[PDB]
Amino acid sequence: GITGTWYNQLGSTFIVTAGADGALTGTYESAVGNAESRYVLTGRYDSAPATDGSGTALGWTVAWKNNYRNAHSATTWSGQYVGGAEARINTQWLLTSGTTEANAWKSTLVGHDTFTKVK
Amino acid sequence: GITGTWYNQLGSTFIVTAGADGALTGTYESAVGNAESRYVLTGRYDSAPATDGSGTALGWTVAWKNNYRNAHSATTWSGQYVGGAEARINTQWLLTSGTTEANAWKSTLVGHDTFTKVK
Amino acid sequence: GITGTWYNQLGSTFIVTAGADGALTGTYESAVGNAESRYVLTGRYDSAPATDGSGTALGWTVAWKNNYRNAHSATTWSGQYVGGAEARINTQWLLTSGTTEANAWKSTLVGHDTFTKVKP
Amino acid sequence: AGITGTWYNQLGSTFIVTAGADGALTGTYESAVGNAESRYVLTGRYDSAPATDGSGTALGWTVAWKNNYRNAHSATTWSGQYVGGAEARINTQWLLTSGTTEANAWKSTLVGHDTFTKV
Ligand SMILES: O=C(O)CCCC[C@@H]1SC[C@@H]2NC(=O)N[C@@H]21
Ligand SMILES: O=C(O)CCCC[C@@H]1SC[C@@H]2NC(=O)N[C@@H]21
Ligand SMILES: O=C(O)CCCC[C@@H]1SC[C@@H]2NC(=O)N[C@@H]21
Ligand SMILES: O=C(O)CCCC[C@@H]1SC[C@@H]2NC(=O)N[C@@H]21
């Protein structure tokens, strides 16, 4: 259910393949921030989720360097996939920028992204 | 400097290889929680960091399923590598469990782990 | 604007008064968790926000002890009030439970609540 | 009662607090970093009947970063627990939200962790 194209509330595009082995691989294109075009992502998901009606835990990382620019930053998304008619991936994320030690207190943004199969 | 065996303040063991393509690959073994033995990890890091004294941004994911146990959960660590005489990786993390829709409000733990190469 | 009765996406009820010099005071009633009835809250907000369309920063705390039970925990909400035709308070929160040192790694839940004045 | 007094975190900030019998926290905060000058009002709450099994005492407080000297249009909340004894600490995680346009709301919130000691 996870493999495919997903869109969050910002209009970013998350292209992912879920491997039989628990791997997530794909590309991420952000609608905002110091980013242009596609970035590599890799992550992991629970390939044998609970028998009951529970979400499928997952996470992935983008480092914001590609052939066009380098923001010296990385975002990790941690969340769960929920299938069905209005399938969603509900996430919280941490975006860490490379900082000097003096500025490390302000290195990390936190937020939440909800991904759907429709824009 | 990222490639190696790292330990956090809980005693967990993070074995990682940093590839020239920006990939992080390896295994994680937690000293705590619903976990036993090693788990696959994958992540990304900035392969061309700033040269101005800033750390190197990175992130990785563990889904807590292996051949022995499945916690139906995933952790993402977002942080930066700080080089020096005593290299360190400073992270914040998000641990999401698969939940029902009604219990989604309590799906995600947050914390912070600091890693060094001192066993 | 901020003063009023607010409800989040869980159906929890946030009754707050914004004071002239930056105080937030009121009661919180959670629809979920180890909680029943109302709890005291206190917080702070920016009483002189920007006038450029930016939201109004604010935050508050609940310790989850009242006359009926005590969860040995506290939540803080950090967020901003967004004025307009549909007033909204958008927050992220941290819920810390009192733990032993050995369990401190799992002391804190994180989430996000959005509040409106629409009664469920 | 162990909460009442002057605390310092790892940044050099000073946290001056009084714990009321009813569960109130009141005092002042002076940050060593950020868009901040002199003391700011804080208010918060703590568990005034904590467990007696060696667990910490849950607490939180808020600073809005306006005082008579300046206004950063931001607020921080600290959520954590007090741990007593010879090496007393208040261990926290925090969320700092800046007032933003809706277009920039995705980057409104910084997250971190502060450890307060009596020294
Ligand atoms: O500005 C940067 O340093 C890189 C781009 C950051 C984009 C963030 S990642 C979290 C949030 N979700 C998105 O789809 N975009 C932003
Ligand atoms: O309990 C689970 O659901 C799986 C084990 C989680 C262990 C967490 S991940 C964050 C923290 N850092 C560690 O080294 N262990 C814990
Ligand atoms: O279970 C507890 O320890 C006390 C109740 C916590 C309820 C939380 S606070 C964050 C979220 N928002 C709500 O309205 N309820 C939950
Ligand atoms: O820059 C601002 O908007 C106001 C100052 C923020 C200071 C933060 S609060 C979290 C962290 N802990 C501190 O003691 N200072 C910083």
Numbering used by the authors:
A (entry chain D), B (entry chain B): 8 to 126
C (entry chain C): 8 to 127
D (entry chain A): 7 to 125
Give passages from the manuscript.
Strept­avidin, a 52.8 kDa protein (four monomers in the asymmetric unit) from S. avidinii, is one of these cases: this 508-residue tetrameric protein has no sulfur-containing residues nor any other significant anomalous scatterers. However, each monomer unit of strept­avidin strongly binds one molecule of biotin, a sulfur-containing ligand. In fact, the strept­avidin–biotin interaction is one of the strongest non­covalent interactions known in biology, and this turned out to be advantageous for substructure determination.
Native SAD can be a successful method even in particularly difficult cases where few anomalous scatterers are present. The strept­avidin–biotin complex has a Bijvoet ratio of 0.6% at 6 keV, one of the lowest yet tested, and crystallizes in the monoclinic space group P21. Using the low-dose, multi-orientation method described above, a total of 5040° (14 × 360°) of data were collected from a large (50 × 150 × 200 µm) single crystal of strept­avidin–biotin over two different areas of the crystal and at varying orientations. At 6 keV energy and a sample-to-detector distance of 120 mm, the resolution of the native SAD data collected was 2.1 Å. The phase-extended map was used for model building with ARP/wARP, and refinement with phenix.refine proceeded smoothly thereafter. Phase extension was not strictly necessary to finish the model building and refinement, but rather to show the utility of combining the low-energy SAD data with data collected at a higher energy to improve the resolution.
